Symmetry: D3
Subunit: 70 residues, 6 copies
């Protein structure tokens, strides 16, 4: 785990939406911003993610778009 | 215009690395957090992205991974 | 917002496959073309998508591939 | 060449922007709809993509978003 | 297709879900790849366990990591 | 511990340089190769040279499956 992703943003898990195969984690990344992650449940279990846990959203730059207010 | 991205990370553009086809924008997203977004140069112009401009990081929830410490 | 995507293809919503966590929306963009988008169900509700709703599919250019016969 | 992508949209290429590493191709998919695909320049040659050629936009469903308003 | 990464392997497991599924390919050499895809897509391709298929992954979506 | 189901181990075979992005190709063993387009500055932090030990990292939702 040294990854090419510059976007490795730290926060605490606030919610986990549990499903059959995929679920949704909710991290408080700090500053009143929150990130949501659709990931496989195999991994949500494997990594030991429960509510209040410490993890990072790890996002590759080419998957981030940009928007403005016009 | 209201989209499926719950991940709308609002921040101020800090840098733009310009390339032939795509470039790399940087928002200072707050909380000491910084995001990198590789996108087309054409898009960077049409939105009017310069340093210190207000924009949002738009990240699809299925593009977010989770990592933890070791 | 606007969004940096050149690929903002407008069409009419024809179907919603409802799931436990995600769903599948399908828009008719015209010319015999349809696009499907798997998104979280909570967002399907947040965007207010009903059958027959008018919308745009939003695809990042670096997310589109090209293939040939 | 059968593939998991639901979106395999046929069209004619109208422009190609060449770059050092990647390029951007643009397809006329019909109906006043056009999709652009940022891909590697290496792959653009291997398929033989020049202007007006027949190809498909291939978009994985989990890569498509939806918009309104 | 424009993806240089078209890695052939044999389907080892398929986890089925309401809308999505996960296929797992053993592409050879102690390597295994998993693909989260729609059930519409898993059924249409006729993917049974052990059938011969390819994992096809876009270059700009692959990251690189090392260990210290 | 990153959530990627695809963490493919291999040695760097080539690094194609660009102004903003570059493209690495790994031999993950068994005649398989992966290509990863990433920022040149990110190749900086990771220090990738040819013949280096690294992993190709792919999230499950970006993998498609194809067949004959």
């Amino acid at each position: 785990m040294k990854l090419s992703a510059r976007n490795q943003l730290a926060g605490k898990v606030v919610s986990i939406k549990e499903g059959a195969v995929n679920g949704i984690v909710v991290l408080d990344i700090g500053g009143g911003n929150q990130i949501s992650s659709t990931i496989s449940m195999d991994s949500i279990r494997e990594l030991g993610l429960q509510v209040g846990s410490d993890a990072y959203a790890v996002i590759k730059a080419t998957s981030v778009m940009i928007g403005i207010d016009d």
